[PDB]
Amino acid sequence: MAYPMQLGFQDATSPIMEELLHFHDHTLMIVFLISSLVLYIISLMLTTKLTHTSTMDAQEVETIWTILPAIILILIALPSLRILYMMDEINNPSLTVKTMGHQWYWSYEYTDYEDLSFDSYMIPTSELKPGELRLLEVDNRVVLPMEMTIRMLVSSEDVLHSWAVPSLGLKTDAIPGRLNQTTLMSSRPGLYYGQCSEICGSNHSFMPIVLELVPLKYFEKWSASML
Amino acid sequence: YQTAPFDSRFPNQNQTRNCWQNYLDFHRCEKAMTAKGGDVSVCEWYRRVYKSLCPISWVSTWDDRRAEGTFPGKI
Amino acid sequence: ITAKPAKTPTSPKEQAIGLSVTFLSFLLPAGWVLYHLDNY
Amino acid sequence: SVVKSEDYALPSYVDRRDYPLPDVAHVKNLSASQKALKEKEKASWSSLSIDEKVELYRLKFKESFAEMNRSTNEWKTVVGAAMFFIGFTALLLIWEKHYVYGPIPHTFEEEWVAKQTKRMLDMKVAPIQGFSAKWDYDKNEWK
Amino acid sequence: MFINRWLFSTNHKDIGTLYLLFGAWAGMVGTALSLLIRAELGQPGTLLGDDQIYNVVVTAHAFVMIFFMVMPIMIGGFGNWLVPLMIGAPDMAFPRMNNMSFWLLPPSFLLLLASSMVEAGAGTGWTVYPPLAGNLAHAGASVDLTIFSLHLAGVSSILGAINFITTIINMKPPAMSQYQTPLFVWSVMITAVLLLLSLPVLAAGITMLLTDRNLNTTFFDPAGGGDPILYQHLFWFFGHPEVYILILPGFGMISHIVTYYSGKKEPFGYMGMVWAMMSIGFLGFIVWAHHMFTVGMDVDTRAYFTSATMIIAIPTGVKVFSWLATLHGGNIKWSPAMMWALGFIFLFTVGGLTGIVLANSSLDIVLHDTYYVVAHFHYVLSMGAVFAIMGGFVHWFPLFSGYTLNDTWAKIHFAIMFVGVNMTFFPQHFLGLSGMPRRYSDYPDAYTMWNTISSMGSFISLTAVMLMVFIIWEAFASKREVLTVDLTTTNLEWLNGCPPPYHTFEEPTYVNL
Amino acid sequence: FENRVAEKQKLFQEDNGLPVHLKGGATDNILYRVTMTLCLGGTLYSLYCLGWASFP
Amino acid sequence: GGGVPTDEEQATGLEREVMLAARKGQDPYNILAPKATSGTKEDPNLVPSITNKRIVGCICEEDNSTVIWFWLHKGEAQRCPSCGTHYKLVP
Amino acid sequence: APDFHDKYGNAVLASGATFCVAVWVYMATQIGIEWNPSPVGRVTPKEWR
Amino acid sequence: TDEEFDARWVTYFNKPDIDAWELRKGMNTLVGYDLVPEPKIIDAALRACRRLNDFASAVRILEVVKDKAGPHKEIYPYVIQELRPTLNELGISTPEELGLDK
Amino acid sequence: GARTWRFLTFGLALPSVALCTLNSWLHSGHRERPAFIPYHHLRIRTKPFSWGDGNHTFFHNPRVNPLPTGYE
Amino acid sequence: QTHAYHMVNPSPWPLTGALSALLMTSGLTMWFHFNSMTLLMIGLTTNMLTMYQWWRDVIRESTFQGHHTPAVQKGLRYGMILFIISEVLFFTGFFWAFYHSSLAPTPELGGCWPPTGIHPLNPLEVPLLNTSVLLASGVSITWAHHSLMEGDRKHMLQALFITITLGVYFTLLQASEYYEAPFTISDGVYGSTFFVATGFHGLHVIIGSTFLIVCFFRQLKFHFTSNHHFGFEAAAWYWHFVDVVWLFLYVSIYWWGS
Amino acid sequence: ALAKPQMRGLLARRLRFHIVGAFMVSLGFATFYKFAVAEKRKKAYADFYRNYDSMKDFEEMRKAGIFQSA
Amino acid sequence: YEEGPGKNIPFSVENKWRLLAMMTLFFGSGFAAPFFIVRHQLLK
């Protein structure tokens, strides 16, 4: 999760989110450099009493205007598209979990072996336990095995929602009649939070996601205990 | 069996038809096997795959409709 | 641009009046609603 | 030299450092003495007095380059007034806080935040750079 | 007389005036809605109610700012006043139909306010996606009144686009080619072509929504074999062109303002400016699914939309660098309108650049439906479209009215609004990178500092809006009548005096070949 | 039928100061008054219907 | 097989004025672009007007995108402020 | 002749700056706004379980 | 070339029957360029002013030489130095001698 | 010319209409209605229609358009 | 003036048109949610009055007052082309919805097109007849146009009457096909696409037929000259548009979609 | 007497000089930013994971009481 | 119709205090409306 006065991304929990951090660093360096250059040139154009007001020839300078931006966009698109295809690559998941959005809570189905399903609701503020996070905790966490490739399938049984976990680089819309796939692989155990990311009515702000990453053996005993 | 494997027929984020096809395949195999008094165990792979991928409410709805006579897929 | 001097000059005091009336026309009605939110 | 609204389609006078010789003289009507001065200007300019030369300048032009290019104190008014109105804005924010906003959630109480901070460190929130990375788990203190 | 002039108008300048008054009033409604959003957000917890009242305010904020403030001011107001004057035309092609484009807007706005008054309002987002906007999750009249409001706004703009394109094509002096028309005029014609092609697709989509809600169709309802994602494609096929519609007239104004206050006779690189606007217009039709990177489309589709969206930076760059080259060597007049335009060049550049970050699908996964999007679009809207509107308003106010503003007051106004909008939106980049979602009435506690600061900036912008009303009052109060305007030889709209007569160009210009 | 366009050209070009929507004579005024009465009356009725629909 | 009126027969108002003027090679309603003279003081461009001033636009060189605009007044020929081309009003 | 700025500019700049600083410092510090700064280097963590 | 440019402008101002419109068009065009005009061009323009009995425009031309130099404070005093013989011959007072730099 | 387009109207276009009118006349007459099956993707009702009893389509034909509960 | 453009007399019809749009939209809201047709019927009535008086005044301005110079007529040509382009893009949305749903039929339909339980019309029966009818009407209106250009009153009237008759035949055939169709607008996305796309096209046929009828009565009254008849040109351009939309509906929905 | 100064092209000379200066500064900033941000981040992640023990981290979390499942 | 400054507008600028009232009502009504709509929605 986010921490107070945060400026940038949540720390990466997955290799793909690591990749997104370094791609963002690359792209933000370009954004800074172009913004700074435009501001500097504005200041340069506005700080001289020297004048030249007769017609100026444009075609020389428009070659620079267009080629250098074109090269910059190629230098953004190459790593961008490398990551887009890395995300898409065939990976062989160990586990499939489904999530169904609802107004206003998430359900989870783990149906590779046994009929395991449950609802996951926000903890009301007035019920938080000392040290728990307002608007982010849920009664029943999405327990999952660490260090394993997981297939998440996302749908909805009512309006649109969208199932997000920033520190894993995940956001997949929850659309009724559709079954969207993403892959999740945590490098670490822990608790990883996210929030509904498509306007869905009265309690959109209040249907969070908590993943609870643990070793396979604990996941297996939890799974058995939830039947 | 751990979960449903990658299927080159359905390589994209939209997995709806993967769920649907495996549900159809299971029920078509089940009808074929029951008709001759064959063995439904031969249909098991499709059962495990659709159970892995398919939302419980989609399976429940489709099962209701097959019983009601309103299932719109061919079995 | 060039222009004539004002046909009807608006003195500092008159500008204070206009500015104060303008601001109050925005602030009082919104202020009244937001003050009374709990009541609603 | 009085400029009239109904003159808008006629050539006009401008002081602009980029248009040094405008389309008309600043003063078109001449008194008897000014008519005599424009006659004298047809003779050697060495015979014109400094005053006469300044008067000829002032018939042709309104402001000199130095006058038209002068700096002003306007920045002080602009900056000070903008700061005034930004300060006025804080009054609206004080009003809002006092009359509109109720208490914020109990999770911002000091003891809650101290417990929440420990639990974030126990779950290793942002342990590479953002948050737990700044805690020394060996010394039990912030780095 | 009063009815005949102001309700029965066939005059481009009076209709322009009506649009500017309507847009000004709509700006106040939009500013109030903005303040409600930032009052809700300005401390943790709940101020007004749950996300339904909140997103009614957010949804109405966007519709009012876009359809009732920016479009009416830029196209209806500056367009009607300036276009005929800049081509020497005696009025628009269809001067009576022009009046109906204006009069459709009060009823459109009435339907929007009715939508918020009945039931629980349309808390849908300005995108109006189903199924939240459908008859189960939004039962009752609110969303249908919203649809009808967009129908009337749409008809208004389509008829206006027909009017502009016809006027610009057909009513120039016979010697004037399209390549001798001012850049503002080009910006309007291109905007009008975008309107013509995009609005009818929105109309189709929202009509499908209406029929799903009222006639038992299932375009967007999977139970009938429909697809909520189809509505997204139809809305965005409009909505991407729509943001180019919102900016293009602004780019035209900026070109005029920068040229004027640089003391230049012409913008740098005229034909490159024309090329850049038509390229932006064209590219703007082939990129819409960059609003859909998280819906589940195929990877190759996401790779295409990433790449086609980024391409837009090339023509847009030519414009920015050409504005800089127009300043270059200028005799710079530090007017209030120049300050607005210099703010626009820089702040629009920053917003455009954050749009380029968003164009990357892989990174958009994490940025989508967060405040990073909200930061991008308010840099190009509150610091771009609005900065061009303010620059054009203070530059042309003496034309329209015959009166001068107090330049010192107008510089104060710029300075306050500059601080307020940056304070409001700069911190929203941090909120978005750190994962704050869009359309939330409340946030986890970690997001408090930047939400607080952003709400304080919204109050500074409120002070600027109140001050602008005073400034307009002071100009009409004082009656400083314009005398001489510089650079009329390259600014035809001023050559008839301030304000120009009711009828201009009754005798057309003489232009030879 | 006979070509009576010339007689309508004379009527609509009469130098009587009337706008084109009223230049055909008294029938035009009647149809204008009916149109504008239904529009303005209907608009007031729409506003009444909003007041009604704005409460439960 | 007849019975459809012609423009000669039935055109009226301004439309008829434009059609009769075109037959005579005259352009009182400014449909055509005027052809330039050499534009010297001896051979100025002649600018018709129904009043004592008219706006000129000067495209100084072929394919310039910038048009130079000014009022031309009854009296002595005036010059384009950009290229010095002469124009003279003919009311 | 001295204009408005020559006469009042210094006073407007000094009074404006002084007012602005004082009222923003008051609003920031004296009325119970919760800024929610970083706990890093500020908060002593406390047992919660 | 620079010499060709300067010669065109000297020739322009040296036309014996240059009229007032031509004097103003010349100076208003020249000050659009990225240069401070060479003394030889200014000498020719000042002599045009004399033929046109226009003392004030001669003074204004000296002001616009100073203005076109911008922050390069060395240029104007150099140009005045080079023009002193012509200023003395024609009785042209500088802006500074007239107090018009205040 | 007019003469050529009249020749096309009476020699090609209207004969074609007459042949298609014949073709339709010949293949008209009521085809047997298919068994009613209450498929969930058909006979959609998410809101009553704003006419009649709310449950009849605008050009309801009792012979061929079953209600959600079957043929009338 | 010494230009050739039309300065229009101040007019009430823009405001009555705008108010008619408020009354129709608020009236449809009242009908859909408050069980009442009153506002809607007032709006439709005011809309019809507005359209009648506005286009009446355009006829007065042009046939009777001579304001349509060549420059004004050229503007009206651009205006009508641009209006038809906007109408093309409106139908493009409905074709996009049709191809979206039929190219990727969802499991609810049976995963097939046409859906399970849909029995399409035979495209070789009344839909083929409707195709011959609108194509024939394109031939007849082209005859009418050439008759008018050639100064032939009687043949213009005959050809335009035949064109209108065919438009009315199409409308009556389509009304019968709607009543006989065993599927309805509530029959999922097949019924939705079919009836909304063909139904907007039917409305356009009715609008185009009405426009042709106005041209018929204007021709009866000798308004058009052999060289000046833009209302007839515009009606013919609109009518070709209606035919082309039908050909795309026929190939897409009735034939390929069957 | 005063020397003849450069009189021609002063605006263009100023522009050339400052655009080169802006290029040289942009290169300096890309080097700083590579070092202060991008490489810093690559090194922070590489250093964190080099000897990272996921099971030890889990045991710390478990013993702190954070989990529902452990 | 009246021409010139102050006459090509649908509102009077003849008296700057009547104008201030009219401008106050005009801009103030638009800015107040969303607050009264919120009030209306809260009182249901």
Ligand code: HEA
């Ligand atoms: C005026 C309004 C406007 C404008 C003009 C733009 C312009 C652009 N926008 Fe923006 N955008 C919005 C208004 C606007 N946008 C709105 C309202 C939304 C939210 C919709 C909603 O969901 O409600 C949004 C959403 C949005 C998205 C979707 C993000 C999401 O929902 O996850 C994306 C995706 O690519 C995007 C991209 C762009 C790009 C690349 C541009 C480009 O046109 C920018 C081009 C400009 C430049 C690049 C700067 C100038 C260039 C240079 C100085 C040259 C050198 C530069 C480079 C080499 C890079 N916009």
Ligand SMILES: CCCCC/C=C\C/C=C/C/C=C\C/C=C\CCCC(=O)O[C@H](COC(=O)CCCCCCCCCCCCCCCCC)COP(=O)(O)OCCN
């Ligand atoms: C001969 C063919 C011509 C048909 C026209 C006849 C009557 C109504 C007018 C239709 C206008 C066109 C489209 C509107 C939407 C739907 C109607 C579609 C065509 C039609 O008539 O469809 C019927 C349903 O009508 C229904 O629901 C009735 C619906 C009546 C109210 C429609 C609501 C209006 C929609 C708003 C229009 C918005 C447009 C905005 C313009 C855009 C801004 C630029 C089909 O009958 P059925 O019994 O379901 O099936 C037949 C079974 N035997």
Ligand SMILES: CCCCCC/C=C\CCCCCCCCCC(=O)O[C@H](COC(=O)CCCCCCCCCCCCCCC)COP(=O)(O)OC[C@@H](O)CO
């Ligand atoms: C149940 C159905 C209800 C729905 C409402 C609509 C119903 C009917 C509308 C039918 C359209 C009738 C239009 C009549 C126009 C008559 C005026 C006209 O045709 O005017 C002409 C100009 O054209 C012009 O304005 C051209 C004007 C053309 C525009 C018309 C196009 C249709 C607009 C329809 C509205 C859109 C609805 C779309 C739904 C999504 C006049 O110039 P000429 O002909 O050259 O004459 C002069 C000569 O005499 C000189 O010698």
Ligand SMILES: CCCCCCCCCCO[C@@H]1O[C@H](CO)[C@@H](O[C@H]2O[C@H](CO)[C@@H](O)[C@H](O)[C@H]2O)[C@H](O)[C@H]1O
């Ligand atoms: C987002 C835009 C809004 C920005 C904030 C506006 C700032 C507020 C301006 C003042 O508004 C007023 O505030 C008063 C309080 O100061 C209220 O009086 C209320 O409070 C008084 C003090 O208790 C009582 O005497 C009154 O009866 C009572 O109505 C009054 O109604 C309200 O109009």
Ligand code: CUA
């Ligand atoms: Cu669920 Cu937002």
Ligand SMILES: [O-][O-]
């Ligand atoms: O739409 O950016």
Ligand SMILES: [Cu+2]
């Ligand atoms: Cu977009």
Ligand SMILES: [Mg+2]
């Ligand atoms: Mg989304």
Ligand code: NA
């Ligand atoms: Na809140």
Ligand SMILES: [Zn+2]
């Ligand atoms: Zn010229």
